[PDB]
UniProtKB/Swiss-Prot annotation, chain A:
Protein name in the entry: Small ribosomal subunit protein eS31
Similarity field: Belongs to the eukaryotic ribosomal protein eS31 family.
Native species: Pyrococcus furiosus (strain ATCC 43587 / DSM 3638 / JCM 8422 / Vc1)
Gene3D superfamilies hit by this protein: 6.20.50.180
Zinc fingers (C4-type), renumbered ranges: 18-39
Gene behind this protein: rps27ae
Entry's cofactor comment: Binds 1 zinc ion per subunit.
A Pfam family recorded for this sequence: Ribosomal_S27
From Swiss-Prot, chain B:
Pfam families: Ribosomal_L7Ae (PF01248)
Classification via Gene3D superfamilies: 3.30.1330.30
One GO BP annotation of this record: tRNA 5'-leader removal
Superkingdom field: Archaea
Name of the featured protein: Large ribosomal subunit protein eL8
Organism (species): Pyrococcus furiosus (strain ATCC 43587 / DSM 3638 / JCM 8422 / Vc1)
NCBIfam families associated with the record: eL8_ribo
UniProtKB/Swiss-Prot annotation, chain C:
GO biological process, one term: cytoplasmic translation
InterPro entries with a match to the protein in the record: Ribosomal_uS14, Ribosomal_uS14_arc, Ribosomal_uS14_CS, RIbosomal_uS14_euk_arc, Ribosomal_uS14_sf
Gene that this sequence comes from: rps14
GO cellular component: cytosolic small ribosomal subunit
Co-factor note (free text): Binds 1 zinc ion per subunit.
Source organism of this protein record: Pyrococcus furiosus (strain ATCC 43587 / DSM 3638 / JCM 8422 / Vc1)
Top-level taxonomy: Archaea, Methanobacteriati, Methanobacteriota, Thermococci, Thermococcales
Cofactor or coenzyme needed: Zn(2+)
Protein's name in the database: Small ribosomal subunit protein uS14
Chain's role: Binds 16S rRNA, required for the assembly of 30S particles.
Keyword terms of this UniProt record: Metal-binding, Ribonucleoprotein, Ribosomal protein, RNA-binding, rRNA-binding, Zinc
Subunit composition and interactions: Part of the 30S ribosomal subunit.
Curated annotation (Swiss-Prot), chain D:
Species this protein is from: Pyrococcus furiosus (strain ATCC 43587 / DSM 3638 / JCM 8422 / Vc1)
Protein name: Small ribosomal subunit protein uS19
GO biological process, one term: translation
SUPFAM superfamilies: Ribosomal protein S19
Family assignment from sequence similarity: Belongs to the universal ribosomal protein uS19 family.
PROSITE patterns hit by this protein: RIBOSOMAL_S19
Keyword RNA-binding: yes
RNA sequence: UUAAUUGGAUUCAACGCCGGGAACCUCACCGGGGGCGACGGCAGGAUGAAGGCCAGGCUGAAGGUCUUGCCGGACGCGCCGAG
């Protein structure tokens, strides 16, 4: 719930959605990379 | 006792009892998501078919996001007066502030009814 | 981490069926038995002293 | 100067591992031919990074059968003999011999009065 | 003597004996590190793992350890009896 903000009628997500498992998958916001903690898949920024 | 800000309609007592019955039957022969981050994930995932929310939740933020997000995703929502009642209907000792049903199971006939009684509440 | 390494070779690759000793294990046609265990099992195995 | 099969330290360094192993004994060349374990490659990466300067940690190790290569010359590493990681330093003359030869696994055996 | 040459075996009736095969193992010896106490009572519980996850400093070394950022959805930390 903390990662979910709401502004003017839309839900903002702090972390991004890992595309392998679909939505609902928050994954590492490391600043330099978007890493997923479930399998180690890393999409560098 | 004024209703909190996230309230958009008044749920009668019989409708709250029916919602708790639906929660119990979905716990028995279906699937419910205890906890509010899981409910948010379900509503985002679209698996949530009805979001039951407690009215006496001391922190407003946990339940504040549910009404506008549910209305955005066209997933009906209902209220129950006590988070303790929602937790007891959830089969867990600790209080569950929000429960999103995924498979009503044998509660569908109630849930589809309750959803109907939800659809008249916003009008 | 809590698993012993597989061993297809050496003495450690053979641990007797009955007594579990890691040392003498005769495998003639695959008995897979310890030497000290063979005395209780030989006569029932059709072995006959001649 | 240092000599090994007609090549000095840098003359050994500039060449790949194939002839570099052809200069090594059978027990070393053949083992290099059959490849290195997952922890030998990791330690090689560690020491290459340290020589570059990236890995600033004092490097300890346990791989006793690690064959010293000329690339490891000029570095200090701590090798395990069973109790502690004894320090050793790699000079150009260490080429062609295992690391586990360089740690006393048995302390000196002296003699006291008989029973 | 060692950290270790593990220990047993005492003349016949101990000493090519256990070992009828020690480079990991064998290990019963030493140094170092990691991990779970089953099933209960007390306690937490869905309030979100206890399983793993990259970049790395300690780790021989491994998300073991920790800064880092998180899910997988669920009963699992811990003291006593008892394992």
């Amino acid at each position: 719930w903390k990662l979910y903000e709401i502004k003017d009628g839309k839900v903002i997500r702090k972390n991004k959605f890992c595309p392998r498992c679909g939505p609902g998958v928050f994954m590492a916001d490391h600043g330099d990379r978007w890493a997923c903690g479930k399998c180690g898949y890393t999409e560098w920024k | 006792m004024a209703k909190p800000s996230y309230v958009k309609f008044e749920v009668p007592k019989e409708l709250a009892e029916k919602a708790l019955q639906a929660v119990e039957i979905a716990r028995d022969t279906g699937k419910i998501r205890k906890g509010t981050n899981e409910t948010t994930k379900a509503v985002e995932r679209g698996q949530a078919k009805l979001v039951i929310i407690a009215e006496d939740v001391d922190p407003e933020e946990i339940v504040a996001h549910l009404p506008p997000l549910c209305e955005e995703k066209e997933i009906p929502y209902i209220y129950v007066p006590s988070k303790k009642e929602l937790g007891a209907a959830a089969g867990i000792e600790v209080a569950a502030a929000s429960v999103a049903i995924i498979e009503p199971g044998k509660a569908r006939d109630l849930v589809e009814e309750i959803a109907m009684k939800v659809k008249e509440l916003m009008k | 981490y809590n698993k012993r390494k597989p061993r297809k070779f050496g003495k450690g690759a053979r641990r007797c069926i009955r007594c579990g000793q890691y040392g003498p294990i005769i495998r003639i046609q695959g008995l897979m038995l310890c030497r000290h265990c063979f005395r209780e099992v030989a006569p029932k195995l059709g072995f006959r002293k001649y | 100067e240092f000599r090994y099969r007609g090549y000095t330290l840098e003359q050994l360094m500039n060449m790949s591992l194939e002839e570099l192993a052809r200069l090594f004994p059978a027990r070393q060349r053949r083992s290099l031919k059959r490849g290195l374990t997952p922890e030998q490659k990791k330690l090689l990466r560690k020491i290459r990074l340290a020589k570059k300067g990236k890995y600033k940690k004092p490097i300890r190790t346990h791989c006793r059968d690690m064959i010293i290569l000329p690339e490891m010359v000029g570095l200090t590493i701590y090798v395990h003999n069973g109790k502690e990681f004894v320090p050793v330093e790699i000079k150009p003359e260490m080429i062609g011999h295992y690391l586990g030869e360089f740690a006393p696994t048995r302390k000196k055996v002296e003699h006291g009065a008989p029973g």
